[PDB]
Design an enzyme around this catalytic site. Structure first.
Site, PDB file in Angstrom:
ATOM      1  N   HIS A  96       0.495  -1.152   0.327  1.00  0.00           N
ATOM      2  CA  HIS A  96      -0.474  -0.055  -0.272  1.00  0.00           C
ATOM      3  C   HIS A  96       1.048   0.698   0.026  1.00  0.00           C
ATOM      4  CE1 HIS A  96      -4.275  -1.176   0.421  1.00  0.00           C
ATOM      5  NE2 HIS A  96      -3.941  -2.049   1.198  1.00  0.00           N
ATOM      6  N   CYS A 137      -0.117  -0.194  -4.712  1.00  0.00           N
ATOM      7  CA  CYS A 137      -1.707  -0.630  -4.456  1.00  0.00           C
ATOM      8  C   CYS A 137      -2.622   0.219  -3.325  1.00  0.00           C
ATOM      9  CB  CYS A 137      -1.927  -1.796  -3.870  1.00  0.00           C
ATOM     10  SG  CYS A 137      -1.007  -3.368  -4.720  1.00  0.00           S
TER      11      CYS A 137
END
Length: 148
Positions: free
Chosen positions: A62, A126
């Site tokens: 992330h 992501c």
């Protein structure tokens, strides 16, 4: 042929640890398919068939802009030549960035796992998962290769 290291089927168990100073990153990676409900717990390989020895390991992390100290948030801060250290069981390997692709997303290195060079580390971000096509909206990528 296929590698067979100690990959724990427990998608909720640290299988390794990525570490980079240029990005002050230090997070664990679970063995499984880079899913949003999972990476939310941390980082994970880009594919469930990945291993700690796949000639090409692709990871997904992330990157919250409002958190300059998370999974793939600072990795954007990294730059070519930025070396890294992938921890596995009781040993740590190292690589040397030598081919950034975060530029145009469509490049001959979306995975670079079908090529035939030397071990390599494909990086993937992501964030903002789009439910339109069921894929990660933005997807910057970076790749490195084993050194000497």
């Amino acid at each position: 042929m296929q590698a067979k290291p100690q990959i724990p089927k427990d998608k909720s168990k640290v299988a390794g640890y990525i570490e980079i100073p240029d990005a002050d990153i230090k997070e664990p990676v679970y063995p499984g398919p880079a899913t949003p409900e999972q990476l939310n717990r941390g980082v994970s390989f880009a594919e469930e068939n990945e291993s700690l020895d796949d000639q090409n390991i692709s990871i997904a992390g992330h990157t919250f802009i409002d958190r300059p100290n998370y999974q793939f948030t600072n990795l954007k801060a990294a730059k070519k030549g930025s070396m890294v250290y992938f921890k596995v069981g009781n040993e740590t390997r190292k690589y040397k960035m030598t081919s950034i692709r975060d530029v145009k997303p469509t490049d001959v290195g979306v995975l670079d796992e079908q090529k035939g060079k030397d071990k390599q580390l494909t990086l993937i971000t992501c964030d903002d998962y789009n439910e339109k096509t069921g894929v990660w909206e933005k997807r910057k990528i970076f790749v490195a290769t084993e050194v000497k």
